[PDB]
Design a protein around this ligand. Structure first.
Ligand SMILES: Nc1ncnc2c1ncn2[C@H]1C[C@H](O)[C@@H](COP(=O)(O)OP(=O)(O)OP(=O)(O)O)O1
Ligand SMILES: Nc1ncnc2c1ncn2[C@H]1C[C@H](O)[C@@H](COP(=O)(O)OP(=O)(O)OP(=O)(O)O)O1
Ligand SMILES: Nc1ccn([C@@H]2O[C@H](COP(=O)(O)OP(=O)(O)O)[C@@H](O)[C@H]2O)c(=O)n1
Ligand SMILES: Nc1ccn([C@@H]2O[C@H](COP(=O)(O)OP(=O)(O)O)[C@@H](O)[C@H]2O)c(=O)n1
Ligand SMILES: [Cl-]
Lengths: 618, 610
């Protein structure tokens, strides 16, 4: 069906009362604390109008027509936004229009003149930061360490999540031209933690240390406060290499350019250390940085050393990335995903995300540059688990994973063809010429190998040798907050729970929530009886008197075994040029051996990183 | 007698074994192997003198066929007062002088020194060649400025400095912050980041100064912050006149707590704020009080520049990005026949001031703004140590009007000749850049301290007028703790009474002057009891004389501070010791007498309180 007509079916559907609480708490703009916005329509309008003002910069538009052209983009943007088919990362919702006079952000589009958009463009203040994901380096000097703590605080203040690889820092007890002797990365990481603890935005930071750093063991056991850090162990070498060393029971030398300190450790003992900690507490994860550089169009002229906090974007030094997600559950139509409307939305969403770069303001000049030059986007999806329920497809099945790979491949195809086109109309990312899209033949920024679309995707990548707006376009984020605004499942995650009682504060209340798809499918009287047990058990699986087909379909996170989580992440990653946010849920009864087995399988699949969460551990 | 003769008396007295251990431990230079380049005090003295003399290269009054002679002459004079331990510079000068320089130039005989040799010492001083103990930086009201100040703390701590700040610009906790739903974290909470920075950058550890002004809305939280600021000394700032605060107090008035970038307001009774300050000091020693207005009253560049903070022990009031190098005279070595040898003292004061001013020239800072602030004002901290031991020798009891009048006259004579030395260096080398906008140039009768307790006052007034025309330094004097340098010097610390006459250091130690004076058949009861007061058959004249910190009541501590502060242009480090039985009201009474006298700040420590 036409995107038009899907917009119609959603545009007058208001957010649930749950989404509305989140919105007034956090999203609706407010001196001294009065609401300038009271409906999601209000958010959609302000954001639509501000992202649309980037069309001022379009070299392919003549001065006459510019107002026409801009209003057209405002209205579609507004329509997909209000309908909740696509929502950008939170910072876009929070910060769009900051610094702009309130008479201009909600004004009827009727009364918008071309000098009103020009006024919007030039009044964006130092806080107009619309992107979620950042990486900064932490060089081996007191100067560079503390510039980086400053950078963390500046990024955080404006609503960014930031990560670093701390491996440049020489090991603890290393020689310093001082003085003393080097504190080592773990103890400097406390300064960064201490800083975010006082910069209150309203897991937060990613800190990575590489597997061959002499302080790695300390780093693995560091969270056992550091409470604001997610930690990952970095593998800048090739996955295959580490797999083989493991398989032969080999040893790894721990060493550092600027220390004499060296140790040999068995790779299995180190792995088991990691797995034991992650079994107990969820940290540290694994970051396969070598796998990310493998698919990075600019490597080695540039290099990915770290991810942002939730691990879904691998970023070079000072790079940033703005994200946004399509609710694929809204795309269900009579046993099929409606690809005609999904194609149009991918097109709109890539333009939306690329225009955000043009109206974004960063607090550090190096970040502004790093971004101008690459124009990395993070288009993803949410509502995927719910889409499966509608299609009657068990999440833990080869059917779901093949469908997942075809769906992502379709999106990757039309995302990169939109980038092709934007490069033609607006100009190429400055670094096209030195990227693998130019200097190579047959370069594809992801593994593929599970879809009919692979040839067409090869064709697209070849075409983008010539025209290409963006270094990379796709990610799957956690969507913790935008999936709640949109009333849908998060990211590619299964639903964690089908039913739970939530609580309204009123003024001076328990109100049962049931998954809406489940509500529409199960006999309402079967629902009434089983509800009690479903809430206590957290699952339908052991509930007598629930039909078997329902149940096979309506699995939640802990019904789905760890390998079936991991393989779903593999299926998506084959068609995503950045990385993926996936929690590998494990049952309380999983051992440290089971965790190691996940890591081992992880090395053989196409995943770019790993997070495990064992039920009841924390 | 001539300083040269006084030197000969001290030059070959070797540092004690206690002093030598300190020296080997952290002052003797080592090579990459951890092998010692220096093994003797003499080597530090040669190294430091040589390095500080090389500043004479920049002297615009020397030829052309003259410079090498004049430099070796300064090097020789510096070397000899150093070796004798008559004057010692602040520790970082000891630690860091000569860094970057080849080792064959550093300890080479003065007589084999060539002009090119000095030129190469000077050119090869590295980024670590940091020779000053005392820093102040601003902490402005923005995340940007806060974390730039945190970077500065780091960089300063790394190269060996102590830094202080006034946090009062930061908006109170809970203030509106544009563009977010979070509230301002507030000064106390942001201090946590400074503490955590210093916990991870080794200096031999730096305590920090943190000040919040009495009229800041978070002031009560600040007073209570120390029961994770374990690195901070904390002082309450009083930017208003001390008269005004004393009055407000006596009249049982109110203080408006407010901030220009917050709606958070409150009114509090001054007596009640003072009582909380006093209760916390009684418990733990913190917070002390910093009379910033009194400091600014005597600041020659006020109001264009202002002092908002001290460095960590409070002895220097510093304007933003300003730093200061210190040095101390061991006055105890100037005793001669029932008198202080003022002939020798005047000469060492002249030498010390030059030595201190030359340090600015070979000093290297890690921030450009500090470099500029120091070039522009050339502030010095010439002090004394050995004061209590010098009183022992003169047979004067520390807790007597006699001791305070003696201290006033002694500090007055030092101030006189230091400021006269500054006039002359002004003339010979050029004035400090800011002289002409300073109150030595723009006022008449500006004197940078209260005087009032000496025969020297009128002569001091004349020298101040003279320095309308020539003046090298904005200010010159201080009294420092001298916590390490009085140890190296084998003498009592700063102006402080000895804390104890005998203390285990399995070691064990007896004050040298008591030792050369007490009938050597007269000790067990002193190491335990801590005093001579209640040993009987110890003659009552030794005893009146040989008093320690806790024999001297709080007002005699405080009036001793006053006596010195009237002739010191920067500030003074003095702890007001109190007996364990003192009450919160006894503290408040110290506070009130402090506000009436000429002291520039207060630190109390009440015995057994930790
Ligand atoms: N004083 C200190 N305390 C603790 N750690 C320090 C200290 N100084 C330096 N470090 C650590 C921080 C960095 O990881 C590393 C090097 O710092 P720094 O010495 O500033 O770099 P640099 O490149 O200027 O000097 P270098 O000549 O030693 O390499 O050692
Ligand atoms: N997110 C935050 N959490 C806690 N404190 C904050 C936060 N943001 C700012 N502050 C504090 C730090 C300072 O004391 C004060 C102002 O910081 P900042 O907003 O960077 O100043 P600014 O000069 O940029 O203000 P403005 O945006 O009003 O021009 O508020
Ligand atoms: N405290 C935090 C934690 C993560 N983040 C960032 O938010 C990014 C995406 O998270 P998400 O998709 O759940 O975000 P929204 O649903 O809130 O848009 C993460 O990858 C982090 O970079 C942040 O800004 N602040
Ligand atoms: N651990 C220390 C001790 C003193 N200092 C600085 O030295 C000043 C003088 O202290 P002091 O006179 O006892 O020090 P020394 O020169 O004797 O070591 C203090 O106010 C600090 O600014 C420091 O930075 N770190
Ligand atoms: Cl020191």
């Amino acid at each position: 069906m036409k995107l038009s007509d899907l917009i119609s079916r959603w545009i007058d559907v208001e957010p649930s009362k749950n989404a509305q609480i989140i919105l007034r708490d956090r999203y609706f703009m407010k001196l001294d604390g009065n609401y300038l916005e009271t409906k999601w329509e209000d958010v959609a309008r302000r954001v639509a109008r501000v992202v649309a003002t980037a069309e001022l910069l379009n070299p392919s538009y003549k001065k006459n027509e510019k107002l026409d052209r801009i209003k057209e983009w405002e209205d579609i943007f507004f329509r997909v936004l209000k309908a909740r088919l696509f929502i950008p990362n939170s910072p876009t919702l929070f910060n769009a229009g900051l610094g702009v006079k309130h008479d201009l952000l909600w004004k009827p589009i009727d009364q918008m003149t071309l000098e009103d958009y020009e006024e919007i463009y030039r009044s964006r203040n130092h806080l107009h930061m619309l992107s979620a994901c950042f990486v900064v380096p932490v060089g081996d000097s007191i100067e560079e360490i503390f510039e980086a703590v400053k950078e963390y605080a500046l990024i955080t203040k404006v609503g960014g999540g930031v990560g670093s690889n701390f491996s440049e820092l020489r090991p603890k007890g290393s020689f310093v031209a001082g003085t003393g002797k080097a504190s080592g990365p773990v103890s400097f990481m406390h300064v960064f933690n201490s800083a975010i603890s006082v910069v209150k935005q309203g897991g937060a930071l990613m800190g990575i240390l590489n597997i061959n750093h002499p302080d790695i063991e300390e780093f693995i056991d560091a969270k056992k406060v550091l409470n604001f850090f997610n930690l990952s162990v970095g593998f800048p070498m090739d996955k295959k290499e580490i797999l083989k060393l493991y398989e032969e029971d080999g040893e790894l030398e721990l060493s550092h350019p600027r220390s004499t300190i060296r140790k040999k450790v068995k790779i299995r003992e180190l792995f088991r250390k990691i797995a034991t900690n992650a079994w107990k507490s969820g940290d540290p994860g694994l970051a396969f940085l070598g796998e990310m550089n493998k698919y990075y169009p600019l490597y080695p002229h540039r290099k990915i050393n770290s991810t942002n906090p939730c691990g879904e974007i691998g970023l070079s030094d000072y790079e940033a990335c703005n994200l946004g997600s399509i609710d694929v559950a809204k795309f269900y139509n009579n046993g099929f995903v409606d690809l005609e409307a999904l194609q149009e939305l991918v097109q709109i969403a890539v333009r939306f995300l690329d225009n955000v770069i043009d109206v974004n303001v960063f607090p550090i000049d190096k970040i502004t540059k790093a971004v101008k030059e690459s124009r990395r986007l993070g288009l993803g999806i949410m509502g995927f688990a719910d889409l499966l329920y509608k299609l009657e497809i068990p999440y833990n099945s080869q059917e779901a994973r093949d469908f997942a790979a075809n769906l992502m491949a379709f999106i990757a195809l039309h995302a990169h063809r939109t980038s092709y086109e934007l490069g033609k109309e607006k100009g190429n990312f400055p670094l096209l010429e030195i990227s693998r899209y130019r200097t190579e033949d047959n370069f594809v920024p992801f593994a593929m190998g599970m879809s009919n679309y692979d040839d067409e995707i090869r064709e697209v990548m070849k075409m983008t040798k010539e025209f290409r707006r963006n270094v990379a376009l796709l990610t799957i984020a956690p969507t913790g907050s935008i999936s709640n605004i949109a009333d849908t499942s998060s990211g590619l995650e299964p639903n964690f729970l089908l039913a739970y009682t939530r609580f309204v504060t009123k003024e001076d209340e328990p109100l049962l929530y049931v998954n809406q798809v489940l509500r529409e499918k199960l006999n309402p009287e079967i629902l009434k009886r089983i509800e009690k047990e479903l809430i206590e058990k957290g699952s339908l699986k052991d509930i007598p008197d629930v039909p078997e087909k329902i149940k096979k379909v309506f699995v939640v996170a802990l019904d789905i075994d760890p390998m079936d989580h991991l393989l779903m992440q593999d299926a998506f990653q084959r068609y995503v040029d950045n990385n993926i946010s996936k929690t590998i849920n494990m049952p309380q009864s999983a051992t440290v051996d089971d965790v190691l087995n996940v890591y081992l399988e992880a090395l053989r699949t196409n995943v770019r990183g790993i997070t495990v969460y064992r039920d009841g551990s924390l």
